[PDB]
Design a protein around this nucleic acid. Structure first.
Ligand SMILES: [Mg+2]
Ligand SMILES: [Zn+2]
Lengths: 49, 85, 611, 97, 1049
DNA sequence: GCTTGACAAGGCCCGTCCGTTATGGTATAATGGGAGCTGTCACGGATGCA
DNA sequence: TGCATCCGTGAGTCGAGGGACCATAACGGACGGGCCTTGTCAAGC
RNA sequence: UCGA
């Protein structure tokens, strides 16, 4: 009952997100690294790229 | 309300009832259409067909008596056989 | 038709009566509901004034009026001069709306009791202050001019107004009560001039109450851009729903199945006809004030039952269904009739595991396929010349002839069928299959699509859907087939894979049994020599077998590149010994120590990836 | 994606509303050729708050608080141009995806 | 006896419950005082019923009796006594099985658990502040007393409304300043007496009326406070409310039970003040000592109480308008508001549930359900995590295993085996006394009523004991104050009487319960209540021994009572003679319809000339073998994977289970038709129906109704009924077609009762109930025909089968006996189960059951193993492997046991004849056949009925409904590229009166058309928003034209 | 190839007949209503209370 | 101007099953005879 | 209420 109401709220907030154009021409980027949770790693850099 | 199974076959009845009427005479087909209410949405009596034509009574009755007699014979009317409900 | 955008606005009283009054070839219009009577008790015909009237909403039967003498299809588009019912179709009753003319104004419950109470924002009052004027609990000053101590829009109690009545100041002091004073307070507003009055109060001496004047300015600015009036928030004309949206049918036992909208519509007209009766015979003012308070509560319970006051009930002690309680809930018109519908050409059954089959193929029983593909079988029967119509085809289907199942076999070839299991978490819970007629009464599902549907064979039922149009068949095949859904949409990892019973068959096949060798340490000539030795009783499944394999791409657990136990033959030829390989260097030959179970596994990938 | 604009005296934009950050830079760059004013503070909305502050009143009334969305849409006079999903399902047309 | 919460509750109502309600209702007076009416409740008649037990089920009636009381109508001035018996109401009686018959359907009354009346204290922290203590004086019926205590020594009284000071209520009831402080520490009461004033006896009733009812009156303040807690017939503590007041507050007075004593309110304040001084106990709401249960004797006492109050208003409205004398007392009592009060409780209340009659195990379980819902219990939304968990006080009272999974997980419990409810409504458990480390198993138990928590030390029934000497173990695990500990055996006080005392009567039928998981034992107890009665049942070989007690208490087993000699036995009756009018007849029902479409057949067991004993089985039921219960069959099993036919919880059976009538049940369906009264003309049942020839008029006896014993198939005519029509609105196409061949249409319409799709069987009961025959009919009906059709269903592909350990599954393939694997003696294998589901769900007891039943197969001894042992590892492994060695010592059976692999043998393949590489565990499993058959899950629809408003297809198997394409199903197609499939599913398949006609015409003609119209559900929402006062419309944005579009017209 | 007198069949039309139905009246005196809510948890505004 | 209290808003998807009384005048459908209207039959132009 |  908690996961069903969470899935419904995620649909209506992102229902009009359709890929319409091919390119926009931006210059910003997102820096991604290895997801390390302290001592051990969980997601490597090869799995995020 | 009526189911769409009876409204679809009502439209298929028009495709087969007008098939046996096209093989008749053009004067014989005109009598059966305006009498029962085909292609106009309104039922007309026998005297109103006699006033738009130059022929008086007792002719439209014997034309329909001749039109209904030839359709009962088992000749060129084999598709109107299982329509009896 | 085709439209492009939908616009919603506040309905003016001239707009509500536009839907009510309709043009009729006479002197006056007849589209007003004046009586609370619905139908007659003796005959099942409605009355000439009421909520189910035929002179307002249209004829009950097709091409037949209420009084008689017009019951043919010849009269189309005329109005009977004796009764007044237009001779037309019966589908016009669900499109015509009547209206109820009130004798006193009534505030809308969505604008008063709502959040953040837009009626109290425009009046510059409080929530409890407007709620005391409405429902007749306090008086509001409408003209405090030429008075000693009086303010504009000041609440007065019942004991405070009778003291000013003894003092007549000595001028004209006008007060008001009910919605007649709120409508007068909204009609004398200054929406063009109050907008510039609040803008000079924001910049000078803002304080903590700057957001209060900002929120009031947003409501005033909306009434100038939309060209609306502030007095339209009170209701003078009440619209009426068409009668097919409040249906009144009779059950088998003789009782009638009415709706809760008919009981809420009757409470408005019964309290409106009593108010017109009390205002005619010059009733005492304590009875007219109590009658207008119940008229305010009847419309507010009709719009939103239980919003302001107590929830009214009927015969059963449940809550009555108002106009707003059919669209907001989980069982409303949005979440049960618009976003989700019950479809035709559908069915369901339990599922069983079908082995010895393929992907994109499902088992479909014969008595369920003859019902889902029923318009497709009937079309093939007339095309082949067996029958001539639908009545000859439907009698041939329900009879049970063996020629019908030969027609159904030729129809479903190439027709995709979408399979579906509730609940649908991800998008791979609805996949299309090519059905085949199987023996039994359950759906033979493939075991490889079982992690996709999250289906287990302990009571799961799956819904069956059949497309109709030619564009829907090409979308179910090119985009929704089960063979094109190997990878999951969440990650990049596949989900079509051996899961439970085929992993144990492949783990035992490529295992190492150190007791049942039966001929280990034998040299065979290639891959095909070991497959021909497994059909005989030569080698077991886990025997140590040297296989001559000239390829270098040999992967194994704990791989190595070092060479141990280097042995040199004659004429310079050196043997390169490994842990699992045996290469004759100068590469001449190469022997691989393996099991015949790993050769059958490696042969299966060769005949499946190379075609 | 949204921002809370403040100091509005030229464009009909009261301080306290939530508009997209791309729409503020589209009107500020279009007003720089004339010369006017002003500031805006970014806000973080939830998944149920950003769903009700959209440009469509049909998509917000079918989700949650039907009596509150239709009251705001009737007073402000909002208009739905049937853009995006969850409207053509209710209308009965093809989805734009 | 296992049914004592239903039999002893209705017996208390017939002698103590009905007498107490009529004594409190009497006497009544008028407005002037002319006459008085008083009843004599302890002399009622309770006359004979009208119909039989089996007759009331087929006649659609209720097994009820008429209630008559003698009534003396006296007058004050003139001396006259009018004695006359007046009819009171219709009371349905409890049958011999413990059930009621309401409208021909058997119903039970589920026992509802609520909170006990009394005072309960609770430490509450509303915020990060001081410690506040609250109170709640709960009565049986009336208003509540909630005493709270804020900071700085302020104790308040809240009587739903705003709170008020403690001195306002304590002085208005009548008290002095010296009678409060003498029985109170009074230093804490000075902080709440400073900021409260000091009111007198009359300076507190005025201020109490000003805050509760906001002019004050000196007479209005006394009538308001007395009507809440001191007036009769408006406030009741109950017999158990007086018991909980004298225990918690330690009061000296007792036996008040009617009026709230003002000295008890002073004791509740004194206990609340002392909680700040670190003395006193805080009560628990989930403790079973504070939670009561009520049954039919208590729930019926509240329905007559609210039914006699409606009768008091009419009895006072008839003795004032009629100012004349000489009137009969039989006309003063109107039975109509009291008849409708009893009929609402048995037929329209939520707590009166439909009885599950699949097998005798579900009938016994449904009469012992403990549900926390009902009119006065809890709510489905108000249930939290604490109320659904297991309390430590549930040890032996409520079953911790048997509960339904899903929505009602923990709210609907089940009573344990040895549990018993006393007269106060608390569950009790028996215990044996232990004296100096010796279990005194010589006398009766103690039956502790959950008072062993803070006082006694209780050991379970698992400790090794000696033969009357001592206890063997040195460390005995016990439970003391809801915590487990191991103490000395000389320090314990009580011990349990049985190891099955914790589990219920349905969980106790699972052998080796200690080896199975608690999650799969929850499913194994629920699947046992869904097993159908087979044609020839068979007793289990690994039974627990408790099946014989559950068969006799179900009520479907004929037992002897006379200790006589059996004389005559046939298939209908058993005639014996009693000895130390001597010929009694035991009737035997043959193929009676149940509530869940099963059979209730009884078979004779005894023979002529045999001595019987009181308590001996004379005739077993449908799902009952000789003596014990039998819900399934003992057949061979093998834990081996086949070629994908047992992949994910699937079952592979053989063909031997089909032709040997194994898992073959009889299902009796019932059809209904009625010749009602149409206002155009009366309907009658004829044989000459139009448009039906001789293809369906073969089984009618010239009356329109079928005969007995006629084989009906799908599509036949059971009752031929016609209905007159008066339309006369024929289309011009049908008028031309009829004018050619003649055959003018009649005024009747065929409304014959027909057999639904996928239904067949043999007709066994064609009982017709018409008027003028001695039976009552519903209004608007001329002839009521009831048809009972019985069919014999074998086991097929798609049926759901399960065992006693939660290993459910669905059969996917029925193989012949030559394809199944076979044992080395040549015997084939019936079921080839999958061993992969065993170690992932901890189903170890099903391996112990099949390996022990295989030892009992070769020996023929029918072991009875009780759960919850004995020596560790010497009682489960060496019992099975030790008894398998004894079966291998026979000279003909040497292949049964092997030394290398003990619980395995060598199995040969049936197709190729070669042995498998590894040995496979075989055994005799006990599988059941559930009610989830493949015939009840088949549904399909092309085009059927539609809805009334939205014009959408309906939903339901019995009314040709369509499958719902919900919101989660749209999101999958929206995530796909299927835009044309989404538009097709929403327009031409639902809610379009025009688009459905053109789409159906396109498939028959062969040319599909695009562009469907606007759906009907959007146009309904458009008219509903316009009726809310919102001017909503659709426009067009075309060039120099902004016009509104007409979607409707 | 069409036409005319004759013989009933039946739908509206216009009277009365009686069941059905809306409306007004009855004179001792009578003068503030009952039926539940009291075991859900979290968040966001709106009062109101110092 | 910040801290308590109260009210309104949400809380999974499919399927099966069962379920006071009376007097008096106005109003309207039913029945019946008269009047054209309409369908049909046998010869004769 | 009962199935997933
Ligand atoms: Mg499953
Ligand atoms: Zn008319």
């Amino acid at each position: 009952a908690d996961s069903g109401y969470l899935t419904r709220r995620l649909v209506d907030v992102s229902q009009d997100v359709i890929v319409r154009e091919q390119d926009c021409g931006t210059e910003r980027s997102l820096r991604v690294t290895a997801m390390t949770d302290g001592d051990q790693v969980k997601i490597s850099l090869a799995d995020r790229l | 309300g009526e189911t769409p199974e009876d409204e679809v076959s009502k439209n298929l009845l028009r495709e087969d009832l007008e098939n046996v009427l096209d093989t008749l005479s053009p004067r014989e087909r005109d009598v059966l259409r305006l009498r029962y209410g085909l292609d106009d949405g309104r039922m007309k009596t026998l005297e109103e067909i006699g006033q738009i034509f130059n022929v008086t009574r007792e002719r439209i009755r014997q034309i329909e008596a001749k039109a209904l007699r030839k359709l009962r014979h088992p000749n060129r009317n084999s598709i109107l056989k299982e329509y009896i409900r | 038709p085709r439209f492009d955008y939908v616009k919603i606005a506040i309905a003016s009283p001239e707009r509500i009566r536009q839907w009510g009054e309709r043009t009729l070839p006479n002197g006056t219009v007849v589209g007003e509901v004046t009586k609370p009577e619905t139908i007659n008790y003796r005959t099942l015909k409605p009355e000439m004034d009421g909520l189910f009237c035929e002179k307002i909403f249209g004829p009950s039967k097709d091409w037949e009026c209420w009084c008689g003498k017009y019951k043919r299809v010849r009269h189309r588009g005329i109005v009977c001069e004796r009764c007044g019912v237009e001779v037309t179709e019966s589908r016009v009753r669900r499109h015509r709306m009547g209206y109820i003319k009130l004798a006193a104004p009534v505030t809308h419950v969505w604008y008063l009791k709502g959040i953040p109470s837009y009626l109290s924002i425009l009046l510059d009052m409080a929530l409890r202050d407007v709620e005391q004027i409405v429902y007749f609990n306090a008086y509001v000053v409408l003209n405090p001019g030429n008075a000693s101590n009086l303010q504009y829009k000041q609440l007065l109690t019942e004991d405070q107004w009778v003291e000013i009545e003894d003092q007549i100041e000595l001028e004209g002091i006008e007060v008001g009560i009910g919605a007649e004073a709120v409508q007068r307070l909204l009609a004398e507003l200054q929406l063009e001039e109050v907008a510039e009055k609040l803008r000079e109060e924001i910049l000078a001496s803002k304080g903590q109450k700057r957001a209060k004047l900002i929120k009031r300015l947003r409501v005033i600015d909306n009434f100038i851009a939309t060209h609306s009036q502030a007095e339209w928030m009170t209701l003078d004309v009440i619209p009426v729903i068409p009668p097919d949206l409040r249906p009144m049918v009779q059950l088998d036992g003789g009782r009638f199945a009415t709706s809760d909208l008919n009981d809420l519509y009757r409470r408005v007209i019964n309290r409106n006809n009593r108010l017109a009766r009390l205002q005619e015979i010059l009733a005492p003012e304590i009875i007219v004030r109590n009658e207008k308070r119940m008229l305010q509560e009847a419309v507010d319970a009709l719009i939103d039952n239980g919003r302001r006051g107590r929830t009214v009930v009927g015969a059963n002690n449940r809550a009555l269904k108002s106009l707003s309680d059919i669209i907001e809930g989980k069982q409303g018109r949005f979440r049960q009739n618009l976003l989700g519908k019950r479809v035709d050409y559908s069915g369901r059954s339990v599922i069983v595991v079908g082995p010895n089959l393929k992907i994109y193929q499902c088992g479909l029983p014969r008595e369920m396929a003859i019902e889902l593909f029923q318009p497709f079988v009937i079309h093939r029967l007339i095309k082949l010349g067996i029958v001539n119509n639908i009545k000859a085809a439907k009698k041939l289907i329900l009879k049970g002839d063996p020629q019908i199942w030969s027609v159904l076999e030729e129809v479903i070839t190439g027709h995709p069928v979408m399979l579906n299991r509730a609940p649908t978490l991800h998008r791979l819970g609805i996949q299309a299959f090519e059905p085949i007629l199987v023996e039994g009464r359950a759906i033979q599902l493939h075991p490889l699509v079982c992690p996709a549907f999250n289906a287990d064979f302990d009571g799961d039922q799956m819904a069956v859907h059949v497309p109709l149009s030619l564009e829907a068949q090409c979308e179910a095949r090119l985009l929704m087939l089960a063979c094109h859904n190997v990878l999951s949409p969440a990650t990049g990892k596949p989900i079509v894979a051996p899961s439970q019973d085929m992993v144990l068959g492949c783990y035992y096949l490529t295992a190492e049994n150190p007791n049942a060798q039966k001929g280990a340490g034998r040299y065979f000539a290639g891959i095909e020599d070991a497959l021909r030795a497994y059909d005989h009783g030569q080698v077991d499944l886990h025997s140590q077998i040297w296989i001559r394999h000239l390829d270098e791409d040999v992967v194994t657990e704990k791989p190595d590149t070092e060479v141990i136990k280097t042995e040199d033959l004659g004429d310079g030829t050196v043997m390169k010994y490994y842990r699992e390989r045996k290469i004759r260097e100068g590469i001449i030959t190469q022997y691989i120590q393996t099991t015949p179970g790993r050769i059958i596994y490696n042969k299966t990938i060769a005949e499946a990836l190379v075609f | 994606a949204k921002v809370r604009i403040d100091d509005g005296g030229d464009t009909t934009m009261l301080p306290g509303e939530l508009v997209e950050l791309r729409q503020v830079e589209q009107v500020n760059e279009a007003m720089g050729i004339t010369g006017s004013a002003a500031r805006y503070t970014p806000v973080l909305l939830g998944i149920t708050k950003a769903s009700l502050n959209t440009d469509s009143f049909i998509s917000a009334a079918s989700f949650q608080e039907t009596t509150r969305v239709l009251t705001e849409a009737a007073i402000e006079g909002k208009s739905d141009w049937l853009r995006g999903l969850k409207e053509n399902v209710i209308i009965g047309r093809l989805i734009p995806a | 006896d296992l049914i004592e919460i239903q039999h002893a509750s209705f017996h208390w109502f017939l002698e103590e419950g009905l007498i107490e309600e009529l004594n409190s209702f009497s006497p009544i007076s008028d407005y002037t005082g002319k006459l008085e009416l008083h009843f004599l409740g302890k002399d009622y008649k309770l006359k004979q019923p009208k119909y039989d037990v089996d007759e009331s089920k087929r006649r659609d009636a209720s097994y009820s009796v008429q209630m008559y009381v003698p009534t003396r109508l006296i007058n004050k001035e003139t001396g006259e006594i009018k004695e006359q018996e007046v009819f009171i109401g219709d009371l349905p009686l409890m049958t011999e099985r413990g059930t009621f018959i309401i409208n021909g359907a058997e119903r039970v009354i589920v026992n509802q658990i609520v909170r006990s009346p009394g005072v309960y204290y609770k430490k509450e922290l509303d915020k990060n502040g001081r410690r506040t203590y609250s109170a709640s004086l709960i009565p049986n019926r009336g208003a509540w007393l909630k005493f709270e205590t804020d900071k700085n020594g302020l104790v308040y009284v809240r009587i739903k409304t705003r709170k008020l000071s403690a001195q306002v209520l304590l002085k208005a009831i009548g008290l002095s300043d010296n009678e409060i402080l003498d029985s109170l520490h009074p230093e804490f009461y000075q902080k709440t007496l400073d900021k409260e004033g000091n009111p007198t006896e009359e300076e507190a009733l005025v201020e109490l009326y000003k805050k509760l009812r906001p002019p004050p009156t000196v007479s209005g303040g006394q009538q308001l406070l007395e009507s809440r807690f001191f007036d009769p017939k408006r406030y009741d503590l109950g017999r158990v409310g007086r018991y909980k007041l004298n225990k918690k507050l330690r009061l000296n007075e007792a036996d008040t039970t009617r009026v709230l004593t003002p000295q008890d309110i002073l004791a509740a304040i004194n206990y609340l003040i002392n909680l700040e001084f670190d003395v006193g106990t805080t009560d628990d709401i989930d403790h079973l000592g504070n939670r009561r249960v009520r049954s039919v004797g208590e729930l019926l006492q509240n329905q007559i109480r609210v039914g006699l109050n409606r009768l008091e208003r009419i009895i006072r409205e008839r003795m004032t308008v009629s100012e004349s004398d000489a009137l009969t007392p039989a006309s003063l009592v109107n039975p109509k508001p009291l008849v409708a009060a009893i009929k609402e409780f048995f037929g329209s209340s939520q707590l009166s549930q439909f009885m599950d009659q699949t097998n005798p195990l579900a009938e016994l379980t449904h009469k012992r359900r403990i549900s926390a819902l009902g009119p006065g219990g809890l709510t489905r939304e108000r249930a939290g995590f604490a109320v659904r968990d297991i309390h430590p006080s549930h040890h032996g009272r409520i079953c911790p295993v048997e509960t339904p999974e899903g929505p009602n997980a923990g709210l609907i419990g089940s009573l344990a085996t040895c549990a018993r409810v006393n007269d106060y409504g608390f569950i009790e458990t028996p215990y044996f006394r232990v004296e100096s480390g010796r279990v005194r198993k010589d006398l009766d138990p103690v039956y502790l009523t959950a008072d062993e928590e803070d006082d006694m030390r209780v050991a379970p029934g698992d400790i090794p004991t000696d033969e009357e000497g001592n206890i063997i173990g040195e460390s005995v695990p016990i439970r003391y104050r809801q915590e487990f500990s191991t103490t000395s055996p000389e320090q314990v006080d009580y011990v349990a009487v049985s190891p099955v005392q914790i589990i219920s009567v349905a969980t106790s039928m699972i052998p080796f319960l200690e080896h199975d998981d608690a999650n799969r034992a929850l499913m194994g107890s629920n699947m046992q209540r869904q097993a159908v009665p087979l044609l020839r049942p068979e007793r289990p070989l690994v039974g627990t021994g408790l099946e014989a007690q559950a068969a006799r208490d179900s009520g479907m087993v004929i037992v002897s009572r006379t200790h006589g000699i059996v004389t005559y036995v046939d298939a209908t009756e058993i005639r014996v003679q009693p000895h130390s009018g001597e010929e009694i007849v035991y009737p035997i029902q043959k193929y009676q319809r149940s509530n869940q479409d099963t059979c209730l057949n009884q078979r004779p067991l005894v023979y002529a000339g045999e001595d019987v004993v009181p308590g001996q089985v004379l005739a077993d039921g449908s799902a009952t073998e000789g003596g014990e219960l039998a819900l399934g069959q003992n057949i061979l099993v093998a834990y081996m994977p086949w070629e994908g036919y047992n992949y994910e919880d699937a079952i592979l059976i053989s063909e031997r289970l089909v032709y040997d009538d194994v898992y073959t049940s009889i299902h009796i369906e019932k059809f209904e038709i009625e010749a009602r009264q149409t206002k155009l003309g009366p309907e009658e049942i004829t044989r000459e129906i139009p448009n039906v020839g001789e293809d369906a008029l073969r089984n009618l006896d010239e009356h329109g109704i079928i005969r007995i014993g006629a084989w009906v198939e799908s599509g036949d005519i059971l009752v031929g009924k016609v209905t007159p029509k008066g339309e006369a609105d024929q289309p011009p196409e049908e008028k031309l077609l009829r004018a050619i061949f003649g055959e003018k249409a009649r005024d009747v319409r065929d409304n014959s009762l027909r057999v639904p799709n996928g239904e067949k069987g043999r007709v066994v009961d064609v009982r017709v109930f018409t008027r003028e025959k001695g039976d009552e009919l519903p209004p608007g009906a001329n002839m009521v025909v009831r048809i009972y059709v019985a069919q014999k269903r074998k086991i097929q592909v798609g049926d759901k089968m399960a065992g006693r350990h939660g290993n459910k599954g669905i059969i996917s393939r029925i193989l012949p006996i030559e394809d199944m694997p076979y044992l080395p003696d040549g015997r084939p294998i019936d079921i080839a189960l999958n061993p992969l589901g065993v170690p992932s769900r901890m189903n170890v007891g099903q391996v112990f059951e099949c390996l022990l039943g295989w030892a009992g197969e070769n020996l023929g001894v029918r072991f009875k193993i009780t759960p919850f042992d004995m020596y560790g590892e010497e009682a489960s492994r060496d019992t099975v492997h030790g008894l398998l060695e004894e079966a291998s010592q026979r000279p003909n059976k040497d292949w049964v046991f092997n030394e290398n692999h003990p619980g395995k043998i060598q199995v040969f393949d049936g197709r190729t004849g070669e042995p498998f590489d590894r040995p496979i565990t075989v055994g005799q499993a006990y599988m059941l056949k559930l009610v989830h058959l493949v015939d009840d899950k088949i549904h399909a629809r092309s085009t059927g009925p539609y809805s009334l408003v939205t014009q959408q297809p309906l939903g339901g198997k019995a009314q040709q409904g369509g499958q719902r394409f919900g919101e989660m199903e749209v999101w999958a197609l929206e995530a796909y590229g299927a835009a044309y499939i989404l538009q097709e599913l929403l327009t031409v398949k639902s809610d379009d009166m025009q688009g459905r006609n053109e789409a159906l015409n396109a498939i028959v003609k062969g040319k599909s058309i695009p562009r469907p119209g606007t759906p009907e559900s959007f146009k309904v929402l458009m008219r509903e928003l316009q009726s809310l006062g919102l001017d909503i419309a659709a426009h067009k944005v075309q060039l120099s034209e902004d016009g509104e579009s007409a979607d409707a017209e």
